[PDB]
Design a protein around this nucleic acid. Sequence first.
RNA 1: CGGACACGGACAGGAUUGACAGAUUGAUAGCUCUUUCUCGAUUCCGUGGGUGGUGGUGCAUGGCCGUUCUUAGUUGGUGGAG
Length: 118
Amino acid sequence: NTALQEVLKTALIHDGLARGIREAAKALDKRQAHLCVQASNCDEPMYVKLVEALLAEHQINLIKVDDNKKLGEWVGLCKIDREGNPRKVVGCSCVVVKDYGKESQAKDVIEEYFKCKK
RNA sequence: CGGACACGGACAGGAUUGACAGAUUGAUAGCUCUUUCUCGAUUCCGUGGGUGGUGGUGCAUGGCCGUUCUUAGUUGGUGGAG
């Protein structure tokens, strides 16, 4: 439960993420891929059928979350503000991190990973 | 586009750059078409707005110069006409 809340959120700042209408399906073909995340409300589940054919066969590693209406202010464009509107952006279904570069609380994500999925 | 910014939408389930091969070209300008690969929020689209101008106006101006002016001319400060 700590893995869901705060320790994924310690390293998502400036790294090689996924952002844009060709990029998320572009940058997954790379062997720098550390821990990633998937929004589990994709309307056609055939896009995520492709990434599940991509993720488990090598060491790519997911966390399931709800959507992108709430991750829409997590990826890098925040629309709610003291002046921003409640609807400017929609986030992504699938972003990655290709190099951490910092070890702030980067253990509870990596401890969770070889904990339950062996 | 070398149209900064302000606002609204379109933007990760598909905005925007680049580009070989073939008509397309005056031309190795993907200019544009044909099929498709590619860059990664940078932007595009409309709406207000700066901008650039060897664009007009020397009869709106400045500065500079030229001339009447290449000759000896010019002017105040406190002094006559019951």
